[PDB]
Amino acid sequence: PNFSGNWKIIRSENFEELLKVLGVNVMLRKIAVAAASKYAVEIKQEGDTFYIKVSTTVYTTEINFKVGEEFEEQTVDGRPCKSLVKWESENKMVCEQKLLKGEGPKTSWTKELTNDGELIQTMTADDVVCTQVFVRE
């Protein structure tokens, strides 16, 4: 019932298939699946404004946004995009993305707090949904 905290991953389903849809070649997909076993997420939320840092062993990115306000980030496979985040319920946000340049699959992500105390992130590329479960550090 509050997104802020330090989260560490405990499940990661369908990641490889998502990267396949995004054109990642086989060997890098496998290395990305290994690296995704160390996903850590740090969230600072205040009202409807968010700072979010997603890190692995060697790579870290920080996102900053307000619900309803377009902002710029990168897709899972690194292509820049304009993103817009909306609420779907008390503890779930959905983000639609659109590419700055070129084209490719429609991408989107979600974040959700379960009442069991988990953080659930999904990432979608066309018809493929990757699901990732996190618990408080």
UniProtKB/Swiss-Prot annotation:
Which residue stretches, if any, does this entry annotate as coiled coil? none
Q: Which Gene3D superfamilies match?
A: 2.40.128.20
A cellular component annotation (GO) from this entry = cytosol
Question: Taxonomically, which superkingdom?
Answer: Eukaryota
**Cross-link Glycyl lysine isopeptide (Lys-Gly) (interchain with G-Cter in SUMO) per UniProt, renumbered positions:** 101
Main location as per UniProt: cytoplasm
InterPro entries per record = Calycin (IPR012674), Fatty_acid-bd (IPR000463), ILBP (IPR031259), Lipocln_cytosolic_FA-bd_dom (IPR000566)
Output the GO biological process annotations, alphabetical, semicolon-separated: embryonic forelimb morphogenesis; epidermis development; fatty acid transport; positive regulation of collateral sprouting; regulation of DNA-templated transcription; retinoic acid metabolic process; signal transduction
Induction / repression:
By retinoic acid.
Q: Which PROSITE patterns match?
A: FABP
Q: Which family does it belong to?
A: Belongs to the calycin superfamily. Fatty-acid binding protein (FABP) family.
Q: Which PANTHER family match?
A: FATTY ACID BINDING PROTEIN
Q: How does it assemble?
A: Interacts with RXR and RARA. Interacts with importin alpha.
Please give the name of this protein. Answer: Cellular retinoic acid-binding protein 2
Could you tell me which species this protein originates from?
Answer: Homo sapiens (Human)
